[PDB]
Amino acid sequence: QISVRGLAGVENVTELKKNFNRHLHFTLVKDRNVATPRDYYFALAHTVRDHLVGRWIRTQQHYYEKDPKRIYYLSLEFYMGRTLQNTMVNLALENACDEATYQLGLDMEELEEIEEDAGLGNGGLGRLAACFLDSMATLGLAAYGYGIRYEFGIFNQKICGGWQMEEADDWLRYGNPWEKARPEFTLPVHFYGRVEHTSQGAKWVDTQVVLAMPYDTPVPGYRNNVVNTMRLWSAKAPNDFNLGYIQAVLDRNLAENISRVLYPNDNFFEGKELRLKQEYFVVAATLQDIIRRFKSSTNFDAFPDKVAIQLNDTHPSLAIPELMRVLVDLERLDWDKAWEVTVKTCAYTNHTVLPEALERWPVHLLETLLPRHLQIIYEINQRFLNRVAAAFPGDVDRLRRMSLVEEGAVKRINMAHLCIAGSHAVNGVARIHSEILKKTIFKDFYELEPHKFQNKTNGITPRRWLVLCNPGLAEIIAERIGEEYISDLDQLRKLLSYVDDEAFIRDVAKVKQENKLKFAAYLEREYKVHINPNSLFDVQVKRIHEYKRQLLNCLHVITLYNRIKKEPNKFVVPRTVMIGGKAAPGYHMAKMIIKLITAIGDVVNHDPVVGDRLRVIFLENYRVSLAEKVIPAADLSEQISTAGTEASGTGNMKFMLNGALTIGTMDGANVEMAEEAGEENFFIFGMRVEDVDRLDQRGYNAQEYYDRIPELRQIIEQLSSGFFSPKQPDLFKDIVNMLMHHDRFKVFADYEEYVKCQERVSALYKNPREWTRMVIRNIATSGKFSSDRTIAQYAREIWGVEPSRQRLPA
Amino acid sequence: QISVRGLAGVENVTELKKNFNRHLHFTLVKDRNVATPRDYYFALAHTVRDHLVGRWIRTQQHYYEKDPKRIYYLSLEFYMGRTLQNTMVNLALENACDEATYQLGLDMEELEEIEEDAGLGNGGLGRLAACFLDSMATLGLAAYGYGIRYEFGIFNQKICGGWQMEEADDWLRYGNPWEKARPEFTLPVHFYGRVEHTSQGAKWVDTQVVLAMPYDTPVPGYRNNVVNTMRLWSAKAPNDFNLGYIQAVLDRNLAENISRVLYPNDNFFEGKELRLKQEYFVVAATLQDIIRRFKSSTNFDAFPDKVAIQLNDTHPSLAIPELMRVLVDLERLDWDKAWEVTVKTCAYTNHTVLPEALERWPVHLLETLLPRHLQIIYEINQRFLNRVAAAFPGDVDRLRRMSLVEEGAVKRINMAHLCIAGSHAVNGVARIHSEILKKTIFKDFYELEPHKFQNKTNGITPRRWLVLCNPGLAEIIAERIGEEYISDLDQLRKLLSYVDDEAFIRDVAKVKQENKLKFAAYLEREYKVHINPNSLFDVQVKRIHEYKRQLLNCLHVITLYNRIKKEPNKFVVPRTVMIGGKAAPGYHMAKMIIKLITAIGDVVNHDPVVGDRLRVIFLENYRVSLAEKVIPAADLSEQISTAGTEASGTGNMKFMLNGALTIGTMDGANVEMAEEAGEENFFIFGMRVEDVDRLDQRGYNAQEYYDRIPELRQIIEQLSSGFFSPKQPDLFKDIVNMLMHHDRFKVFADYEEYVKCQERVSALYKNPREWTRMVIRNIATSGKFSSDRTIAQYAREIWGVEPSRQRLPA
Ligand SMILES: O=C1NC(c2cccc3ccccc23)=N[C@@]12O[C@H](CO)[C@@H](O)[C@H](O)[C@H]2O
Ligand SMILES: O=C1NC(c2cccc3ccccc23)=N[C@@]12O[C@H](CO)[C@@H](O)[C@H](O)[C@H]2O
Ligand SMILES: *Cc1c(COP(=O)(O)O)cnc(C)c1O
Ligand SMILES: *Cc1c(COP(=O)(O)O)cnc(C)c1O
């Protein structure tokens, strides 16, 4: 149908059809009389998987022959979403499969909707991992994603009476056709035990063994015939485990619990033993694999020339002492040589500002679980603090602040400190964030080793986040400037010469309108709710957190509502306000915010005076596949974190690419986005970082704003008095109380400037042509925010490898 | 190579080869450079599975169209063993696959050895289930095996220092290519809750739900293109289960424990809740499936014309009250009509003599777990005892003895009593056993309803147990009388006209010698032990139990040893004595017997005076696949249970078919075996049932035998004094003590007659020609012991269906 989706050759279509029927019969053991849509999805999935296989085998073969330097991306999270469409896009099979399925009398779109999200992540960090794998494959890097195959991913969110309920994401129930179990590459991982000191150095003995069984998933690059591997480990008990009889067999589940469930805390740290077991499990199994592969090329001097290990935050920080343990205790390298190898191998990406999100493991935990690793950590600390002392003689305070070991009631290891010490490169994930690392939280580490600190501004893959989710926009772009932009997104800048082209303006607005119609219809069928598709689609989708200030959004929504009620017969630009996201199960306040959103909806959406001028919708179960639908439908992207709290953000980039204007603070990558588009093409409001600091010094008194802003006082009185909760008038006292006395994120401070800025948005929306021109200026300057740019910077400036757009043979 | 293995057409071989390479590439994602024998096994397995698929789909289609009466074989055990060779035999693909693999440079036999046994059974009962499925498919019956997909089957037996160690049978580790998960046919099963009585009858409420997910495995008939289904249920938690967050997800394992592990008690009853959950789980899921299928043909009068349910012992006895519960509580039939339907649908096979093996469930267990089923059981009991009272007025004692409810400290339900009451047919598993049911343990039930009691003497499938495990013997038989005997084993009787044919005598002895050479070699490589292949192979393989009197065998072995030591320079027929089997993990005495066997081996096998004249070998990890190797190699089959204790036995039949002579008691099917062959062609010894009764009346005094038999006294003194346990002289005091004071199975009573009979065996073995002639007379009369005969009797005399040898189209 559309060009970017590839050719549908007669031969290709015929071949896909016959392979689809072969899999239905032989693979699924169904005839056409009893097959369900789900059988058809599986038959198609198996058919597309077959086109990966040749390329996967040849790619891995190629890496054995050429023996390039290998990149190991260690993450506890890969937020992959669905695989079927992504595979079709990257192998140029989408039109052929559409055609082949059409002729079988099936609708491919309906079959795509049957696929489960692989939800093995919480949000931004997990998704960044997924976007990176895509870009690494597209840039022909010999890269491997390593993580955990959780049996249960991020929970499915149900709303009951306006409250979040969690239910288990049983994503493997029907089988995963994309993974290949490799039970033959199973590896032992050790826990507990104790350290014996002998003549021949330290020995780790009397350990409990858990096996790590790898599952490999193909990662296809964009039309380059490259297929990289994502290897995820699953925990399995050894067969002698506990070995009255019956109970011993049932107790195998204790070991296998390690890979059972993803911890659902976005940007918070819980010091749980099971979480630490997950961290070591992935590190220990991965390092053995890395070393095995390296030895099939006694001399570890070349190790860093053949191996890069990237740590996705501190979650796999144990890679540093584990690498030391293997090199020192097993390979019998001296300490200094092993340390050299380790530093030159490892690099650490920080994704964290908020101190409560930083991993600080109690020493008693590490002592019991990983006795040898704790010894190695103490040794690292001593040698590190010896260098600090020599460089800064007499600065005893610096020594305290820089220690890997935090003193206190409980001693803790600061895993971030361990990562900086043991890595040749430390980066943040947007320029402002990287600067903040150098100026505040790692100021001391920066002064000792300035050379280590880099920036790598985040990005998103334009495959999933444009071509896949928004084919209509991809196509009208491709009509003017060709297809090359999909693997070279800077080419979108050529669209600035179409900003006054009437036809292009018409087409950009048409695509947006079509996406909105399609999303409105989706809301009706799947969730029995009606919305005006001619309204401005104001969407804030992201995990529910105080720093992201969904509450600020709520305050705006109630303001619009109170303004309509005061002057019912005055024109206002209609809006559909859509807020979506999951709260961490133990985060009370996040759960109250969801409840407040739905309570506002309950009042606003049933007020007859409001009409269809204002609708508030909570989007249930926000996940990757819902993001692919709602982001192409959005007009206004809400990126309204308190300045200094969002390290980067990546949602922001998704919306920029997909033809929404941004209302945001100068936070994270918002800063670079506004710089690329021009500040005049961006709705900036609120305190800068500098302003937040000024407020903190003299002290934040919310009362002052309540006293000076009547519109805000009204809202707070409504909340307090039960306007939004008639049956339980005090339901939201925790929210009021926090806003008035304990608001770390200064919601009131940005309120006035936000509401004013929101008025400027409405004004521009009244002028479709000028709205769409500003949209074009955004899309056209979004090139920097491709993960291809990001990975190319990682490769040249950290990993020491050159990317390539050259194709492997087919 | 050999004719019974089928044709190797040029086309067939070429096609198998290309499909093997296709699966290696696309299914396994391997090239030939990195593939292991295990990858080759899987490629072959997937290639053979493909030939089942067409036939499986067409067979199930046929049953929908023709709508024949359906047979449901409910068992907690299916001891299937390996599937690959069996599939090849039944589809006539064995020579073609041999040829195809040969040309790929692989050895098919080596690939067969990589397949795991499906060990979802303990021994005789589980294997009977497997043999039956084979015969049901071969006889074209619309039959379904229903059971539990245990994650862990019967444990792997290791011997350490002569002691049994158990380790977990992780049979699914590498995947099961033979099963098809059917997650779309998942069904809820209920536990706990309580009963509400309303206007509209009883309601079972506030239950815990476990889901039952079916896995289907194909069961091919012998060259008739019929493929039946074995459906096994796996337990899965619902997604709202327990739904702090993390722990709720981890607690899902409590529900899934139901299908985790097979209980390893052969012929013993443990009243464990988890075992009762397994029993209900398989019953509840199966009955829903049965009813669903029946409704796709409100009127249950035809239910018994369309459904037969066979209960494999009492393990699925809850099918009776469950069927009543569904019909009465859900379908709203009146009690009497529902009861009629139930009785006419259900039939019960008893496999049990020993009272400690009979299932007697505490009422408090059923009360908590299955409140409604207990109500229905009490109601069944009342109405049943009302009929007893009317037929036998005043016989209050009979009422007590026949009650489904046993009075005592703990009240118990006698599940056997429930099965007789609720079934139209009750059978034992050999003639002597069926008579004993009528004369002793169910005498009362027989007098009330004589029409219900039948015999169905057990059998073994000649596919696995001749063609598959002993191709050389199959072939020389086929040379003379053709191939038809494989599906009509009575034709073996034609071999009696070859008993004086010199060439046939030569060939039978040659095959035996080749099997022995091959098995001797197997012992050397896999277990570093050497044996004389010219010795008589005396084998006793079966689960370790007191009633099977492995100890009697031990007494014979020590007798031979003491006789050699007394007269070292006298000729004795050389013997390799091989004893194998598993003990239940909590059965102390069975574990001591294994230890004694290995301790005798430790003395006998290292005595230089003995030479290679006597060797004692404990065969480790006896299982179906080891039985396929050792049974064709055997000369003497040891079937030496105390008269009245072995319900049937089936090992006995396997050896008869495979050219071993039998030494046995008149127990179980031994009686019918001797009647078929002629008593002169069988080594019968020991007490009959009548003799055991006579001994019990006056009392069994072991001392008397010890006092009168010097040879036996010597053995007991050796055991006591530490001759067989020098470092621990009192190691075997429990064994001595039991033999002398607490022997329920009267080992000493049969000792003299056993040893004498063993001398007659040795004498005949000195005369090869006459030994082989007697072997021929055994093989030739083994036809009755085909499971095809057995199933044909079940079908005509219980299920009311006619078997068929007519082929479905290919
Ligand atoms: O989305 C994120 N979660 C965590 C994060 C920070 C700290 C601890 C965690 C623990 C688990 C999961 C995620 C985290 N960090 C985040 O990383 C993204 C990728 O660079 C950034 O765009 C976000 O601005 C940042 O908030
Ligand atoms: O092998 C068997 N196990 C049990 C058995 C009896 C009682 C309780 C059980 C519980 C679990 C497993 C098996 C049993 N019964 C047996 O059934 C076989 C098939 O008819 C007979 O040939 C055996 O003579 C008999 O011993
Ligand atoms: C991109 C993405 C995120 C990250 O969004 P932010 O707005 O940067 O927090 C979270 N969740 C999903 C499902 C995404 O696709
Ligand atoms: C046939 C068989 C049995 C039953 O043997 P008996 O001697 O009748 O107890 C037990 N186990 C296996 C592995 C078998 O093949």
What gap in Å lies between CA A782 and CA A376, rounded to an integer? 45
Instruction: Output the CA torsion sign for A565, A566, A567, A572.
Output: negative
CB A72 within 8 A of CB A309: yes
Whether residue A243 and residue B180 make contact (CB cut-off 8 A), yes or no, is no
Q: What angle do CA B722, B726, B730 make, to 5 degrees?
A: 45
How many C-beta neighbours within 10 Å does residue A524 have?
Answer: 11
What gap in Å lies between CA B360 and CA B408, rounded to an integer? 12
Give the residue among A371, A361, A480 at the shortest CA–CA distance from A411. A361
Name the closest-CA residue to atom 6, ligand 4: B651
Give the residue among A305, A309, A312, A306 at the shortest CA–CA distance from A322. A309
| Burial zone of A395 (CB within 10 Å; 0-12 exposed, 13-18 middle, 19+ buried) | middle
What gap in Å lies between CA B523 and CA B517, rounded to an integer? 10
A 204-233: CB under 8 A from B? 216
CB B258 within 8 A of CB B277: yes
CB B261 within 8 A of CB A246: yes
What gap in Å lies between CA A474 and CA A468, rounded to an integer? 9
Structural domain boundaries of chain A?
Answer: 1-459+787-810, 460-786
Which letter does DSSP use for residue B230 in this model?
Answer: E
| Burial zone of A374 (CB within 10 Å; 0-12 exposed, 13-18 middle, 19+ buried) | buried
Q: Which amino acid is at A456?
A: K
CB A398 within 8 A of CB A444: yes
User: What is the full DSSP assignment across B307-359?
Assistant: EEEEEETTTTTTHHHHHHHIIIIIT---HHHHHHHHHHHEEEE----SGGGS-
Q: Which pair of structure tokens corresponds to residue B737?
A: 């003590």
Q: Which pair of structure tokens corresponds to residue B62?
A: 């046929």
- Pairing of the two strands A70-74 and A143-148: parallel
Rg (CA), chain B: 27
Q: Which pair of structure tokens corresponds to residue B540?
A: 């006793």
Fold: same for B1-459+787-810 and B460-786 = yes
What gap in Å lies between CA B778 and CA A483, rounded to an integer? 81
What gap in Å lies between CA A74 and CA A132, rounded to an integer? 12
What gap in Å lies between CA B307 and CA B142, rounded to an integer? 10
| Burial zone of B468 (CB within 10 Å; 0-12 exposed, 13-18 middle, 19+ buried) | buried
How many C-beta neighbours within 10 Å does residue A663 have?
Answer: 25
How many C-beta neighbours within 10 Å does residue B809 have?
Answer: 7
Determine the longest span between alpha carbons in chain B, in angstroms. 89
Please report which helix (H) or strand (E) contains residue B112, including its range: helix B108-112
**Burial per residue of B150-172, b for 16 or more beta-carbon CB atoms within 10 angstroms, e otherwise:** bbbbbbbbebeebebebbbbbbe
Which letter does DSSP use for residue B795 in this model?
Answer: I
CB B679 within 8 A of CB B654: no
- Pairing of the two strands B156-160 and B163-167: antiparallel
Q: What is the tally of helices (H) and strands (E) in chain B?
A: 33, 23
B779: left (phi over 0), alpha (psi -120 to 50) or beta: alpha
Residue whose tokens read 């397949």: B115
What gap in Å lies between CA B87 and CA B84, rounded to an integer? 5
Give the residue among B73, B71, B74, B123 at the shortest CA–CA distance from B647. B123
Which letter does DSSP use for residue A664 in this model?
Answer: E
Q: Which amino acid is at B409?
A: A
Site to probe by mutation for ligand 4, drawn from B457, B645, B650 as the one with most ligand atoms within 8 Å of Cβ, is B650
Residue whose tokens read 């070279």: A488
Q: What angle do CA A649, A652, A656 make, to 5 degrees?
A: 150
Which letter does DSSP use for residue B399 in this model?
Answer: H
Instruction: Exactly one of B277, B543, B556, B623 is catalytic; name it.
Output: B543
CB B665 within 8 A of CB B640: yes
Strand partners, B208: B191
Rg (CA), chain A: 27
- Pairing of the two strands A536-541 and B536-541: unpaired
CB B228 within 8 A of CB B143: yes
Count contacts between A and B (CB, < 8 Å).
105
Please report which helix (H) or strand (E) contains residue B776, including its range: helix B768-779
Q: Could you give the 3-state DSSP secondary structure of residue A252?
A: helix
Q: Is A104 on the interface with B (CB under 8 A)?
A: no
Strand partners, A213: A234
What gap in Å lies between CA A607 and CA A629, rounded to an integer? 28
Distance of CA A255 to the CA centre of its chain: 28
Which letter does DSSP use for residue B761 in this model?
Answer: H
- State the fold for domain B460-786: Rossmann fold (3.40.50)
Q: What CATH class does B1-459+787-810 carry?
A: alpha beta
| Burial zone of B752 (CB within 10 Å; 0-12 exposed, 13-18 middle, 19+ buried) | middle
Cβ neighbours of residue B771 under 8 Å, at least 6 residues apart?
B661, B764, B765
What gap in Å lies between CA B387 and CA B383, rounded to an integer? 7
CB B87 within 8 A of CB B132: no
| Burial zone of A687 (CB within 10 Å; 0-12 exposed, 13-18 middle, 19+ buried) | buried
What gap in Å lies between CA A216 and CA A185, rounded to an integer? 11
CB A152 within 8 A of CB A262: yes
**Burial per residue of B569-582, b for 16 or more beta-carbon CB atoms within 10 angstroms, e otherwise:** eeeebbbbbbbbbb
* Integer CA distances (angstroms), B53 to A29, A352, A417, B47, B597, in order: 6, 54, 59, 11, 47
Say if ligand 2 is within 6 A of residue B649 CB: yes
Instruction: Exactly one of B654, B777, B784, B789 is catalytic; name it.
Output: B654
What gap in Å lies between CA A440 and CA A426, rounded to an integer? 15
Q: Is B390 on the interface with A (CB under 8 A)?
A: no
Q: Which ligand is nearest to the CA of B359?
A: 2
Strand partners, B205: B194
Whether residue A180 and residue B57 make contact (CB cut-off 8 A), yes or no, is no
Cβ neighbours of residue B582 under 8 Å, at least 6 residues apart?
B154, B155, B157, B164, B264, B266, B543, B544, B621, B622
Q: Which amino acid is at B301?
A: D
| Burial zone of B197 (CB within 10 Å; 0-12 exposed, 13-18 middle, 19+ buried) | exposed
Closest chain A residue by Cα to residue B184: A174
Q: What is the tally of helices (H) and strands (E) in chain A?
A: 33, 23
Give the residue among A645, A765, A734, A656 at the shortest CA–CA distance from A693. A645
Distance of CA B498 to the CA centre of its chain: 33
Strand partners, A526: none
Residue whose tokens read 């695509």: A511
* Integer CA distances (angstroms), A564 to A537, A572, A753, in order: 18, 8, 20
Whether residue B31 and residue A61 make contact (CB cut-off 8 A), yes or no, is yes
Chain breaks after residues in chain A, where C lies over 2.5 Å from next N: 243, 297
Residue whose tokens read 């009991």: B381
Q: Could you give the 3-state DSSP secondary structure of residue A146?
A: strand
Give the residue among A735, A739, A764 at the shortest CA–CA distance from A750. A739
CB B319 within 8 A of CB B286: yes
Spell out the alpha helix ranges (H) of A357-501. 363-369, 371-391, 396-402, 415-421, 431-436, 443-448, 462, 471-481
CB A230 within 8 A of CB A145: yes
SS (H, E, C) A201-234: EEEEEEEEEEEEEEEEEEEECCCCCCEEEEEEEE
Distance of CA B71 to the CA centre of its chain: 20
Strand partners, A577: A538, A616
Q: Could you give the 3-state DSSP secondary structure of residue A647?
A: coil
Whether residue A174 and residue B165 make contact (CB cut-off 8 A), yes or no, is no
Which letter does DSSP use for residue B808 in this model?
Answer: P
What gap in Å lies between CA A502 and CA A769, rounded to an integer? 9
Name the closest-CA residue to atom 22, ligand 2: B649
Instruction: Output the CA torsion sign for A492, A493, A499, A500.
Output: negative
Rounded to 5 degrees, what are φ and ψ at B663?
A: -105, 120
CB B303 within 8 A of CB B291: no
Q: Which amino acid is at B671?
A: V
Whether residue B253 and residue A249 make contact (CB cut-off 8 A), yes or no, is no
Establish how many alpha carbons lie within 13 A of residue A292's alpha carbon, considering only the half-sphere containing its beta carbon.
9
Q: Could you give the 3-state DSSP secondary structure of residue B271?
A: coil
CA-CA-CA-CA dihedral for B73, B77, B78, B81, to nearest 10 = -170
CB B444 within 8 A of CB B451: no
Give the residue among A619, A597, A616 at the shortest CA–CA distance from A605. A616
Q: Which ligand is nearest to the CA of A429?
A: 1
Give, rounded to a whole angstrom, the gap between the first and last alpha carbons of chain B: 25
Cβ neighbours of residue B143 under 8 Å, at least 6 residues apart?
B70, B71, B72, B73, B133, B136, B137, B228
Crossing angle of helices A588-604/A733-741, nearest 10°? 110
- Pairing of the two strands B307-312 and B70-74: parallel
Residues in chain A: 810
Strand partners, A220: A227
How many C-beta neighbours within 10 Å does residue A728 have?
Answer: 10
What gap in Å lies between CA B793 and CA B797, rounded to an integer? 6
CB A217 within 8 A of CB A230: yes
Rounded to 5 degrees, what are φ and ψ at B777?
A: -65, -30
The answer to the question of whether B498 is labelled as a binding residue is no
Distance of CA B609 to the CA centre of its chain: 41
What gap in Å lies between CA A308 and CA A146, rounded to an integer? 13
Q: Which pair of structure tokens corresponds to residue A134?
A: 């895509």
CB A659 within 8 A of CB A473: yes
| Burial zone of B561 (CB within 10 Å; 0-12 exposed, 13-18 middle, 19+ buried) | buried
Q: Could you give the 3-state DSSP secondary structure of residue A261?
A: strand
| Burial zone of B665 (CB within 10 Å; 0-12 exposed, 13-18 middle, 19+ buried) | buried
Establish how many alpha carbons lie within 13 A of residue A322's alpha carbon, considering only the half-sphere containing its beta carbon.
24
What gap in Å lies between CA A79 and CA A118, rounded to an integer? 7
Based on the residue annotation, tell me whether B543 is a catalytic residue of this protein.
yes
Which letter does DSSP use for residue B447 in this model?
Answer: H
Question: In angstroms, what separates the C-alpha of A279 from chain B's closest C-alpha?
Answer: 16
Q: Which pair of structure tokens corresponds to residue B200?
A: 């509209």
Cβ neighbours of residue A290 under 8 Å, at least 6 residues apart?
A70, A72, A307, A309
What gap in Å lies between CA B752 and CA B559, rounded to an integer? 11
Question: How far does the centroid of ligand 4 lie from the alpha carbon of residue B148, in Å?
Answer: 20
Chain breaks after residues in chain B, where C lies over 2.5 Å from next N: 243, 297
